[PDB]
Write a protein that binds this ligand. Structure first.
Ligand SMILES: CCC(=O)SCCNC(=O)CCNC(=O)[C@H](O)C(C)(C)COP(=O)(O)OP(=O)(O)OC[C@H]1O[C@@H](n2cnc3c(N)ncnc32)[C@H](O)[C@@H]1OP(=O)(O)O
Ligand SMILES: CCC(=O)SCCNC(=O)CCNC(=O)[C@H](O)C(C)(C)COP(=O)(O)OP(=O)(O)OC[C@H]1O[C@@H](n2cnc3c(N)ncnc32)[C@H](O)[C@@H]1OP(=O)(O)O
Ligand SMILES: CCC(=O)SCCNC(=O)CCNC(=O)[C@H](O)C(C)(C)COP(=O)(O)OP(=O)(O)OC[C@H]1O[C@@H](n2cnc3c(N)ncnc32)[C@H](O)[C@@H]1OP(=O)(O)O
Ligand SMILES: *C(=O)CCCC[C@@H]1SC[C@@H]2NC(=O)N[C@@H]21
Ligand SMILES: *C(=O)CCCC[C@@H]1SC[C@@H]2NC(=O)N[C@@H]21
Ligand SMILES: *C(=O)CCCC[C@@H]1SC[C@@H]2NC(=O)N[C@@H]21
Lengths: 541, 210, 541, 541
């Protein structure tokens, strides 16, 4: 039937209130700062290396992805802020690599493009981190993976941090070997010069493409040949495109220039015989009834004041409709059913500290979402986990452990978004990074640490007051201020969205408004895989 | 004689092409299982940044580069040489004809949009303009080697000749199998390296073009 | 039948040769150094903290594991050298934690014991690394996991390197939640005081044990209660054993002291209903015909001289018998069939640089071992991958890629042992760390880097000579020596077994002789899991 | 997206060239000869037996199949040339039986009709061969099978060649028993008189139909009753339709005449509850850009001259589009991706002798087609396998063995078409008859033998010259001509399309032009079955 009317969420905020004006101004300042930083990261290695990249007839890497995907298609870039002030004097825009999800010939493909304008395309340790994150996104979601090889190889001064470990560079080839055994098609397009470790990236591909007078593959370079042998050889005579397409047989297609290689890539993807099948149910899409500059005004920059998380769920779902599950029992957690772009979503959000009733409500809701095969969207705004003697007497530990067990055993596509603070073990309960969500984005006001700066400063102040009163010396106000400034300063600097996103702890600082669109894009890629049956472990009753 | 197109007319041609590509995207979606989904809207919505598409249109003999920025509100900002136009519009049908509805810098117009192979036709009440889409080299490109190690029966051409593509240059027999070489290339032969009755080997060059 | 006679490997080495005397003396020096270093690491946090640990009636952690396992059982410790000079002035013996495999009530269990004598049992980032390595060893091999909780919590100054990432501390609880869904039993024994993040380790256990007046569980400590509330509470009144066994219900068994807790642990393991089933075939065991102080004499300390790898395979297999597969085609790789302790092993070893014929032989042998469900033992002694113009013309890249694809897709229990150098992408082909072997041990003469020190020094010398001759300045012998000393020094320091094993890049520097016994122990644990069917990807022909 | 433009194959041939005129004239002569031979085979047993068949109110068998299938439907006859000059003075048109694939009530059914005008409908050994071929076509493709029983029984003088072996007559009932266990519906329509071995063909049917005063079933005839007992009984009193429908219960439906029986057959097929499901992806169909009288001109009759196989692939695929895989490495094999009638096809064709590079390219392409579940169309034009001392030194044997292993392990619907010669073990590599393709058609210029006539004549001439020079006698030109005429004559006669298709070595000589339509029909039937996962054996590297 699906025809009767249903009430909807949402409250029109007081746009004249000075709290709204201050929250709106401060969040707008954060978003403008984000805008100008990503416009500086977009240029890449600078105009000198861009001139030397276009003087060789090479398309710039963002132009390569622009000519590769379907015309007019949205590109979802992942981890644009990697390597941001991560090395001391070495400015590495984008990590050196451009990874994202796009629509190629009607198929959602995962694209990995070596930016050669930044340090010769050399692999930094953060470049390997970003690449392995992209490859497990492609394996979780069953996305066909496209590589645009134009590297330079590991970065020798940092070679330890690139070479031997489990999640170091060689894992890349592991990821291409396993994904080929699962029918997830791997295409490599040699547009540059992979050398001596990176030459396995074209050689382990199910179907390969190379470019004449521009693309070289060899396991050993002309310096290594001139040192070990003494035979002078060039690059094109040693591992050029004519040699590899005609004699050795490493490359499978041959391309005149860059546009021909991207055209051939689209042909190879079109002949993959892939047909998308959704097992979830879809309703005809709709729109939120409230705009998202109101999310600028509602949420704001200060983490001291709380807000209602329902005013976020009114702004991001279809029709602003939301079936709230167990609405009065433990209202520090808001769990309900909504739809984004037709997809059914089970939305879990925070409203305060987590009592035991909140953890029981969360465990029940995650079990419902895994029994009905509904995806889960977690929204994190956490302060902590409700300290007190009575609550530890009640067994607040086993209830948080039940929520952690049900979140970790869940097989549905989970997506985390950190709309505020994310501190401590509550971060584990609300499906943080270590619990394998599909995607994890953050907002530019978020903070993430092991505790807040004030919590660390105040428990260290009380503990040192306790041990000095056992000692006997005078612990004054100035000693307390000299005790409290570096703890607050360190937890503020290292809890930033830019500190967390300089690594690949999160998949990218996103704008609040774009939040709605971004979630839809994320969920679309996550529905490219069939949904497995969830089986939980032992619930500690 | 033919007159050059105005920059506004190039904006209309670029918009018609972009909307035609959208139409193809929409009719693909109508056949998809994954209906209503994002990626189907040809919005060009990049994350935190804008998308600019650089296309080239051929106006008569001359090429013009148009940089099309996709705006968040569905409009386009098209910069042709230096001048930026605010370009909006859509397609609509009346019977069996497709019309392009434009608004360029606040100036509304309507023209019939017909795209036949490479040529964009705009039929308006002030004239008719034909703008061509350039064809890339790798769609318009369509010396020789010996197939095996055999003896040559008959040569055909010498230096100073001219053959056109799909021409017999040589016939060679290799373990009793008559192989007639042909020309993918073109021009004039400068040297024939093997005279008739000699032994040619595998992947050995037969003739040459200078 | 199994009765007819078969020739055997092995050559009696020239014990009077001065090469044998020098190789034996230098390897004996390495092994004695290893012995005294591990005897210093065994004491732990020192005599002051050991006195304050035994003054509270607590068993020391090595005594806990000694009273937990079956009487007389061998214990296989993993990563004894973690944290060795890894932090600047902070000496962290064993990482702060003692992980290994033992035999409890007849079952091979994996034991994880928090050493509380070293920095209060606080979690360093290497402690989290070592713990997560132990937990994936337990998940690969289906070993029931026992935790002896006596922590202190994360280490705040290092909190970033412990808290948020994917393979940071919270992953631990993910690993206990997934393993409980697979019937891999998790027992936690609270012998100490887990606090506020570590309290999930007892709370997520399938069956728990706690100790009176000694074991406290709480999600919030008495400093946090005294700061947030202002209520003074102790540790035992807040989260003691009587409160948790009687009112809250977190603990399931109750123990008087440490011996009672280990006795109750053995009871809980005995009532797990686990019965080991081998799917491989077993023959009656035998012994090598040659001793392993001969391996001291054969292998030695210098990596310049080669040796025969067959003289290693004569010293570690049963009966010194070895069916060599494809013995003449590409004899820089030695692949054959042997047995250790009855178990059938497919042994792959090196003898030089890897030509394309060696990679083809390796791919064929790994396909045979996965076709017959035979385990694989890889022995790494690699210099490189055979540079030259002709070999890159032959397609040496696609042959190494075929070996990497067959090694990465293989489902049999693989065990790597690095008996010499392990440099570069050959390390990826011979199943290094990133390709998920079961265990990876090294010998005390091994080196592992991205290239040798001489390769890096010499290719950088030739490249800088090439660019200065394009420049014009004089590059003399002294400039070359000042160019070649820090490259050699850095690649020698960071290629060590102690540098690689201070992290958890390898599961432990082992003695050469003990090598035989250690492999048998490793293979026994790896046969606790049924063997899955291998399916490879696309072989690049 | 699927919208951008792609280059296409095809060259307009020189229609004025005298080579084109001679090739066109000779192929047109072959096709006209084929036409008049099949128009003589169509009449059947001749006008006397056709008059005695229509004098009993019986529809002729081609009229039966014309009234059985959907109106206007194309019928694909298989093996129209069986029994062509296969017996000495016995002319057996069509083998005595008419087998094909048709469209009945919307379902692709396999129809087997006993032509009773040719020798009483008696079973010749070639009739049993043709019938068992039809039944395994129905089992491979999951086609419901319809029998139109109007036999006479085995052919006694030939009884050995019909009775005892594995693939002799009794296998028929095996094939109906196995196919009924798999839900492949078997309908028998008794229109004639099956007798004493053939009476199991109606009795083992899932649903049966019989005709009054015309259809008799008995396990023993009136001669056998009159000999063994002495009781005179007729045919209709012994095993008529009234007796079987009313008392014995062998028949399930009862029919007045032939039209009623075919109407009831269409009812029985309509109530089978079968719904066709395609697992491949379909694109909207198109047409070749070049006609196929150009295939007459291109291919011609002489096997000495080569042609380009790409000019065949331009003439048979949709849009003349063809994504060529690995186009320069080993160009004596042409492998690519195309579409016929919307179906995705992987096309493998020949261009000369098979070097080792050609076999490696073929193995890679067959692995891609089985990895993506794409059907395979093999086009055979083989001379041999590249003799030489160097090539045997390279290991040309193991590369052909790799292609044979990947072709034999492949689970996709393979279809072979022999457009030229097919000699020797290359015939095994390019998926000949013994490697179980779905269908195998040939062109009227093809030759198939164990070697060419000239190869056999010339190696026997050189070997006998070698042994006579060891002997000493004179081996002249006339002795060589008397040595070379019967070898050439025998290999020319027994290599014919009519010699190969008089048996059921191939499913029928087809016209070149009709080739396009025929392949589409074949592929449609082959997609009536779901596609299984391919698992290969051991690739000899
Ligand atoms: C055997 C096992 C392995 O596979 S480990 C191999 C280690 N990798 C290498 O040494 C490969 C060498 N890399 C290169 O491509 C060479 O430097 C060559 C071919 C000369 C690069 O040529 P060109 O295109 O002009 O360089 P570029 O302008 O892109 O260089 C950018 C800047 O980065 C540097 N760079 C590049 N690769 C490395 C590297 N692997 N290690 C250290 N530095 C590297 C370049 O020197 C260059 O420095 P700058 O930014 O121009 O000042
Ligand atoms: C929710 C997030 C998490 O799960 S991570 C939270 C961070 N963890 C903590 O701060 C827990 C506090 N640790 C403790 O156990 C307390 O220090 C108390 C209870 C006082 C330890 O008492 P006691 O048994 O006397 O200490 P000990 O002798 O074992 O201490 C050894 C030395 O190490 C230190 N230590 C211990 N834990 C930490 C820690 N987490 N961060 C920093 N330092 C730590 C102790 O201060 C002590 O220093 P010292 O070696 O004696 O000079
Ligand atoms: C126990 C296992 C077995 O089932 S072995 C049993 C062997 N089968 C038989 O002998 C069945 C006998 N076949 C017949 O149907 C009889 O010949 C009868 C009923 C008389 C056929 O009648 P009618 O319809 O007039 O014959 P027709 O004109 O169709 O005969 C065509 C020509 O072929 C002959 N024919 C037929 N069947 C066989 C046979 N099995 N063996 C040998 N010859 C056979 C007929 O004699 C007849 O010869 P002609 O072409 O008319 O000169
Ligand atoms: C003041 O400086 C902060 C004291 C503790 C922080 C509060 S107490 C309740 C919340 N839960 C938690 O674990 N920390 C938060
Ligand atoms: C001398 O200083 C070393 C030069 C290169 C090292 C050699 S060359 C052959 C081996 N393979 C390889 O890649 N490195 C080794
Ligand atoms: C001449 O009479 C024929 C000699 C042999 C036939 C040729 S040699 C190369 C082709 N490969 C093969 O095995 N036979 C063909």
């Amino acid at each position: 039937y699906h025809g009767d009317s249903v009430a909807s969420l949402g409250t029109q905020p007081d746009l004249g209130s000075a709290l709204y004006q201050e929250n709106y101004k401060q969040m707008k300042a954060l978003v403008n700062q984000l805008h100008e930083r990503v416009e500086h990261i977009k240029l890449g290695g600078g105009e000198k290396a861009r001139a030397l990249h276009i003087s060789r007839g090479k398309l710039l890497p963002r132009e390569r992805i622009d000519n590769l995907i379907d015309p007019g298609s949205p590109f979802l870039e992942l981890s644009q802020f990697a390597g941001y002030q991560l090395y001391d004097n070495e400015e590495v825009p984008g990590g050196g690599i451009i990874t994202g999800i796009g629509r190629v010939s009607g198929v959602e493909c995962m694209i990995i493009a070596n930016d050669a304008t930044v340090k010769g395309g050399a692999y930094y340790p953060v470049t390997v981190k970003k690449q392995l994150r992209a490859q497990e996104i492609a394996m979780q979601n069953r996305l066909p993976c496209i590589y645009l090889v134009d590297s330079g190889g590991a970065y020798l001064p940092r070679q330890a941090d690139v070479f031997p470990d489990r999640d170091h560079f060689g894992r890349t080839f592991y990821n291409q070997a396993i994904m080929s055994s699962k029918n997830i098609a791997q295409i490599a397009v040699v547009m540059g010069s992979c050398t001596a470790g990176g030459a396995y990236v074209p050689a382990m591909a199910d179907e390969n493409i190379i470019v004449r007078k521009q693309g070289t593959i060899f396991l050993a370079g002309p310096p290594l040949v001139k040192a070990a042998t003494g035979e002078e050889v060039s690059a094109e005579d040693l591992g050029g495109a004519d040699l590899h397409c005609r004699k050795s047989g490493v490359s499978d297609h041959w391309a005149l220039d860059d546009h021909h290689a991207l055209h051939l890539t689209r042909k190879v993807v079109r002949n993959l015989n892939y047909q998308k099948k959704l097992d979830v149910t879809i309703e005809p899409s709709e729109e939120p009834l409230f705009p998202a500059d109101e999310l600028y005004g509602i949420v704001g920059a200060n983490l001291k004041r709380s807000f209602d998380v329902r005013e976020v769920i009114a702004r991001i779902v279809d029709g602003s409709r939301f079936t709230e599950f167990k609405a009065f029992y433990g209202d520090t957690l808001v769990t309900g059913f909504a739809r984004i772009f037709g997809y059914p979503v089970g939305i879990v959000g925070n409203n305060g500290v987590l009592f035991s009733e909140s953890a029981k409500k969360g465990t029940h809701f995650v079990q419902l979402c895994c029994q009905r095969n509904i995806p889960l969207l977690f929204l994190q705004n956490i302060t902590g986990f409700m300290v007190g003697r009575e609550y530890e007497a009640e067994g607040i530990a086993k209830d948080g452990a039940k929520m952690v067990a049900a979140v970790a055993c869940a097989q549905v596509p989970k997506i985390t978004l950190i709309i505020g603070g994310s501190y401590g073990a509550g971060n584990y309960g609300m499906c943080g990074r270590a619990y394998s969500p599909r995607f994890l984005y953050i907002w530019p006001n978020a903070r993430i640490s092991v505790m807040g700066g004030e919590q660390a400063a105040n428990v260290l102040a009380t503990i040192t007051k306790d041990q000095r009163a056992r000692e006997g010396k005078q612990f004054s106000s100035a000693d307390e201020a000299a005790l409290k400034e570096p703890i607050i300063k360190k937890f503020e600097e290292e809890g930033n969205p830019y500190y967390s996103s300089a690594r690949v702890w999160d998949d990218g600082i996103i704008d609040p408004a774009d939040t709605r669109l971004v979630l839809g894009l994320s969920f679309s890629a996550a529905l490219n895989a069939p949904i497995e049956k969830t089986d939980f472990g032992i619930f500690r009753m | 004689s033919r007159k050059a197109a105005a920059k506004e007319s190039l904006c209309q041609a670029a918009l018609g092409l972009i909307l035609k590509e959208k139409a193809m995207t929409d009719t693909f979606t109508l056949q998809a299982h994954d209906q209503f989904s994002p990626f189907s809207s040809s919005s060009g919505r990049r994350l935190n940044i804008s998308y600019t598409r650089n296309m080239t249109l051929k106006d008569g003999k001359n090429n013009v580069a148009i940089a099309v920025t996709y705006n968040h509100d569905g409009s386009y900002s098209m910069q042709i040489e230096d001048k930026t136009f605010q370009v909006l519009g859509n397609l609509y049908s009346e019977g069996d004809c497709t019309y392009l509805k434009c608004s360029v810098n606040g100036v509304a117009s309507k023209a019939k949009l017909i795209i036949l192979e490479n040529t964009i036709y705009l039929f308006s009440k002030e004239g008719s303009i034909e703008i061509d889409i350039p064809v890339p080299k790798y769609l318009s490109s369509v010396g020789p080697l010996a197939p095996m190690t055999g003896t040559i029966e008959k040569v055909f051409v010498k230096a100073g000749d001219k053959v056109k593509a799909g021409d017999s240059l040589m016939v060679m027999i290799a373990m009793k199998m008559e192989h007639t070489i042909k020309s993918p290339k073109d021009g004039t032969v400068k040297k024939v390296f093997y005279r008739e009755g000699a032994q040619a080997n595998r992947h050995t060059p037969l003739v040459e073009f200078e």
